[PDB]
Design a protein around this ligand. Structure first.
Ligand SMILES: Nc1nc2c(ncn2[C@@H]2O[C@H](COP(=O)(O)OP(=O)(O)NP(=O)(O)O)[C@@H](O)[C@H]2O)c(=O)[nH]1
Ligand SMILES: Nc1nc2c(ncn2[C@@H]2O[C@H](COP(=O)(O)OP(=O)(O)NP(=O)(O)O)[C@@H](O)[C@H]2O)c(=O)[nH]1
Ligand SMILES: Nc1nc2c(ncn2[C@@H]2O[C@H](COP(=O)(O)OP(=O)(O)NP(=O)(O)O)[C@@H](O)[C@H]2O)c(=O)[nH]1
Ligand SMILES: Nc1nc2c(ncn2[C@@H]2O[C@H](COP(=O)(O)OP(=O)(O)NP(=O)(O)O)[C@@H](O)[C@H]2O)c(=O)[nH]1
Ligand SMILES: [Mg+2]
Ligand SMILES: [Mg+2]
Ligand SMILES: [Mg+2]
Ligand SMILES: [Mg+2]
Ligand SMILES: [Mg+2]
Ligand SMILES: [Mg+2]
Ligand SMILES: [Mg+2]
Ligand SMILES: [Mg+2]
Ligand SMILES: [Mg+2]
Ligand SMILES: [Mg+2]
Lengths: 219, 239, 219, 239
RNA sequence: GGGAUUUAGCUCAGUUGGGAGAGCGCCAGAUCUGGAGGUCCUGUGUUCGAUCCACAGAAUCCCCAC
RNA sequence: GGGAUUUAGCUCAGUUGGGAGAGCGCCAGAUCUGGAGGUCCUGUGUUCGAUCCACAGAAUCCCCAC
C-alpha cells in the first residue's frame, strides 16, 4: 500500500513559504465572545500560535507573518526533506492544536496549508502582496461592519462599486476613523527571532524603512 | 501564483492516514502509561468519532490504533485537492485530540492520501492490521527490554533481528503474556456507522413506514480482517 | 540532487491509460511524400510502432488503440512501479524511436505522453470517447481537404457553423464518398494479443458487437 | 478529465536529465566496443547537439556521459508542464539517437526534471561529474573482472565493497591504467554555445558595427568542475 | 485538429527591420496648456540591427464535437 | 473576504417536504395532434419521507483589490 501513497514522496525546493489559512473560521469561531470585525484576543492568539510554532515545532522557520486568519512561514531549511504532504499536514496540525490551546476551545478547528514555491528574490514581493491583502480586508470588513450595524445582501449592495477612499469617507461619516486604528489591523504582525519577539507595529514592507526591515528578517 | 501543488487532485475511493508526530516521547513525558494507556486510545477513538461527526467530511469509517487513524472516503471536499484535504484533516485531528486530552502543549498529526481501487480497499486495512500487530509485539518487547537495563538502540536492533516467536518467549519469561492482553491493543478500534431499523408515521399514507438510522459506534473487539467472520465484517463496513 | 528530483517518485494506480500524441507532426512529417488528409503508409507505421511497443518494450500493455497521430495503451500492470515521469518519458521515447525506424526518418520526431488515471469501469467509455475523436477529425479533415483543393483562412471560413451532415453532403457533391472510405480512417486500428494481431476493421466501441469486443480486449 | 498529472508544473531554473534504458546490454548486443565505444559517445554528443539545434527548446547547455545527458533550462515550453517536457524531450532524444546510430530496433530514454536554485546550478553538475568518474571506474573494473571469469553479481559486489584505490590497483595489474585513458571517459562531454565576435555594416549609420554569433561547440576535454579553472568555466556556461 | 487575437493601468490605432502613438483613466498644477507611464505575450534563431522575419511555445476567443 | 446563480440537449419557469413543468431543439410520423428525454450541482445529516430544511463543499458570475 506504500505504492498507493502516490503523493508521499512529492517534494519542493528551498526557499518555500507555507501559508496556513483558518478553515471556515467565520462559522467555527462564532458563538464565542469575539468582537467584530477585529478581536484583539484572537489576533493575540494567532501571534502566540505562530510563536508557539517557532519555539516548539523544531522545524525552524526564519519568521512568521500573521494577520487573521492566516500565517505565512518562511523556510530555507525544508522540514521532512521537502515532502509536500508531510509539511502541509504536520504544520497545519500543529497550528490547529496550538490555536485550540491558546483559545481553550471546546470544539475543534482546522487550518488549511499550502506551499508557495518562491525563488529567493521573490520573497519580499510575496509578503508585500500578503500585506496588501491585509489592507483590503481591513478596509472592506470595517465598511461591512459599519453597515450591518442592514441585512447581508443589503449591506453588501451598498458597498458595491465603491472604492477604498469613499469607504474611508463613509466610515468616518459613520464615526469610524480608520487612519487612527491599531497598526496590527492595517498591517499585521511579525513574529521572529535568540529570543522570540512579536512585532505589532511593523512597517509597510515595500517602503523605507520597510524594505531593509524585511531584508534583515530574511538575512 | 507559485502555489504549484494547489491543483493536485486525487480520485476516490481513497484512504486518508494520519499519524501522530513524536507521540511516543510526548505521551511518555506527559505521564501516560507505558507502553499502552487506555485513556489515550479512548482519546484516539473519540477523536476519530468527532471527525466523523463534525468535520464536514464523510468518511465511511475509521480504523485507529497506536497513534494512527485511517479514514475511508468515496467522496471528498475541495474537489479532492491533496494539500487542502491533508492539511485540513490533520489540523482538525490535532485540534480534536488536543481537546480530548486537554493538552497544554501542542501536538501534531502527519497526514497522507492513499489512492485505492474498489477491489483493493479490504487489502489496505488488512496490511494496516498487520502493522497494528507488528507494533503490539514491538511496543511491549521494547518495554520489557528497557525495564531490565538494555539501551534504546540495542533494544531496537534486538527487536529487529529477533523473530516474533523469540520475542513472545522473552516477553513470556518476564511475566508478559501477549495472548491475554486486550484485543484493542492487538487489532485496534473500528469507528463506524451502525444501521438500525426504525419506523414512523406517514400522515399522507396514513400508515406506519419503516426506515433506517445510523449511529456512530466504537468497536473495541474487532475480528481479524482476513478471518472467516472478518471478511464480511469489513465488506459491510465498505459496502 | 536527488532531493531536487521533486517529481521522480510521484505515482499512479492501476488501471492507467497512456495516451501518446505526436508532437507538432503537421510540420515534422511534411516534406515527405505523405498523402492528405490520410496516408496508408503512415497509419501502417503507427500500428507497427504500437505493435513494436507491445512486442519489444517489456512493459506489457493489454492492448493499443491507435489513430494518427495518437496511440492509447491500457495498463493494469504498471511499469516502473507506477512512476509518472519514468512511464511517460520511457514510453514516449520508445515510440519516437520505433516510429523513426518504421519511417526511416532523416530528422528527429517526438511524441508527447500523458497518464489518464481511469477506474476500471471507465475504461470502455474512454476508448469510446477516443473513437468519437477519430470520427470528428475524420469528417472535418476530409472537408478541410475537399476545400483547399482555397487559402487557410478561406477554406476555414467556409466550414464554419457547418455540422457533420452538411459536411457529408458537401463532400459528396465535391466527389468524396465518406461512407465508403476505409474503416481505419473512420474508426482507427486495434493492436493486441500469443501472437500480436493488428485489427484494421474494428467495430464501433459503444454498440453490438462492439461492446463485447472491447470487453474481451480488456478481459 | 482524469489526466490528473497534466497540470503539474515546474519553475525554472531546471535541469532535465535523460538516461538510456537498458543501454549497457543493448549496446553490448549490437557489437559496440566494451566498456567504451567512441562511436557511441559521438552519437550521444551529436544527439545532444541536435536537441540544442532543432528541438524547439532552448537548453543553455548539455552535459553528457555514459548513457545520460543533462540539459540546463531557464525557460521552458508548455508552461513548464512535467509530463509534456519529459515525454517530448525523451522522445526527441530517442528518435535522434536512433537516427545517429541507424538503429534497426528501438531504444528509449528515461527522463526527469531536477528543480534547482540559481546558486545551486554549479553543484548539480559537480555531482553529475562525480558520477561520471564513479561510472568510469566501475565500467572498466567490471570489464576487467568479467574478462578473467568472475560472474556478474560477484563482480558487482566486488566493485561495491572494494574501495577506489583497490580497484585502481586491480585494474593496473591487469594492464589497464585509468590515468592515461581519454578525458571524455572520465569527465564526459560539454555541448554549449560558444560566442564569437563578428562585425557587419550598418547602412543607416554608414559605419561598421560589432556583434556576437554563437556556435554550438562540443568540448571533449572539459576541466574538473570544482578545480581552479573549472569554476569560471562552468560559471560562464551558466552565465 | 482548424481559424484568429495578444502593443501604456483601460479601449484601441500603427509596418513587415533604425526600436512606438491616440482617446479614456492617472499624478503636477467641469476646459485648456505640464507630466509620468512599454517586455510591442515568452524563449531561441536570422540580421550590423527585430514589436515586424523564421522556429518552438504561452494565454484568451470562435468553429467542429459531445 | 462579501454578494449571488446552479432544475430536460438549449433558454428559463416552479415551493420552503408526498419527490417536477413551459418554450426552442430532438426522434416517430413550413402547422397541428405522438413521443422521448431529470442527479432538481455533490456528499452527509434532520425527517416516516428531501429538488426545498441543517452542515461541509463544488462549478460559474459580480463587488472589493492590484
Ligand atoms: N505510552 C504510550 N505510547 C503509545 C500509546 N499508543 C501508541 N504509543 C506509541 O506510539 C508510537 C507510534 O510509533 P510511530 O508513530 O512510528 O513513532 P512516533 O513516536 O509517533 N514518531 P514519528 O511518528 O514522528 O516518527 C509507538 O512506538 C507506541 O509505543 C499509548 O497509549 N501509550
Ligand atoms: N558498451 C558500452 N557501454 C557503454 C558505453 N557508454 C556507456 N555504457 C554503459 O552504459 C551503462 C549505463 O548505466 P545505467 O544507465 O545505470 O544502466 P543501464 O544499463 O542503462 N540500464 P538502466 O539505466 O535501464 O537501469 C554503464 O553500465 C556503461 O557501462 C559505451 O560507449 N559502450
Ligand atoms: N476537433 C477538436 N479537436 C481538438 C480539440 N481540442 C483538442 N483537439 C485535438 O485532439 C487531440 C488530442 O487532444 P489533447 O492532446 O488531449 O488536448 P490538447 O488540446 O492537444 N492540449 P494538450 O496537449 O496541451 O493537453 C489533438 O489532436 C488536439 O489538437 C477541440 O476542441 N476540437
Ligand atoms: N478581497 C478578496 N479576498 C479574496 C479574494 N479571493 C480570495 N480572497 C481571500 O483571500 C484569503 C486567501 O485567499 P486564498 O486562500 O489564497 O484563495 P482562496 O480563494 O481561499 N481559494 P483556495 O483556498 O481554495 O485556494 C482568503 O481569506 C480568501 O477568502 C478576492 O478576489 N478578493
Ligand atoms: Mg482559502
Ligand atoms: Mg480562513
Ligand atoms: Mg483568511
Ligand atoms: Mg507509526
Ligand atoms: Mg507517529
Ligand atoms: Mg496536444
Ligand atoms: Mg499530434
Ligand atoms: Mg492527435
Ligand atoms: Mg545511469
Ligand atoms: Mg541507463
Amino acid at each position: 500500500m506504500k505504492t498507493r501513497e502516490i503523493y508521499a514522496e512529492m517534494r519542493c525546493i528551498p526557499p518555500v513559504v507555507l501559508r496556513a489559512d483558518g478553515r471556515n473560521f467565520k462559522n467555527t469561531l462564532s458563538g464565542l465572545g469575539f468582537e467584530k470585525p477585529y478581536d484583539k484576543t484572537f489576533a493575540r492568539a494567532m501571534a502566540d500560535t505562530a510563536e508557539l510554532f517557532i519555539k516548539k515545532s523544531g522545524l525552524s522557520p526564519l519568521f512568521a507573518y500573521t494577520f487573521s486568519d492566516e500565517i505565512s512561514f518562511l523556510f530555507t531549511d525544508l522540514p521532512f526533506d521537502g515532502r509536500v504532504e508531510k509539511i502541509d499536514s504536520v504544520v497545519a496540525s500543529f497550528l490547529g492544536s496550538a490555536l485550540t490551546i491558546k483559545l481553550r476551545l471546546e470544539e475543534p478547528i482546522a487550518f488549511d496549508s499550502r506551499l508557495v514555491a518562491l525563488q529567493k528574490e521573490e520573497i519580499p514581493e510575496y509578503f508585500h502582496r500578503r500585506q496588501l491583502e491585509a489592507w483590503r480586508n481591513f478596509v472592506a470588513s470595517w465598511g461591512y461592519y459599519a453597515l450591518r450595524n442592514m441585512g447581508r445582501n443589503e449591506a453588501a449592495k451598498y458597498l458595491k462599486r465603491k472604492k477604498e477612499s469613499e469607504i474611508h469617507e463613509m466610515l468616518f461619516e459613520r464615526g469610524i476613523n480608520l487612519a487612527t486604528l491599531p497598526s496590527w489591523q492595517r498591517r499585521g504582525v511579525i513574529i521572529s527571532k535568540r529570543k522570540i519577539t512579536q512585532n505589532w507595529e511593523i512597517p509597510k514592507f515595500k517602503s523605507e524603512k520597510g524594505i531593509p526591515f524585511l531584508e534583515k528578517l530574511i538575512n
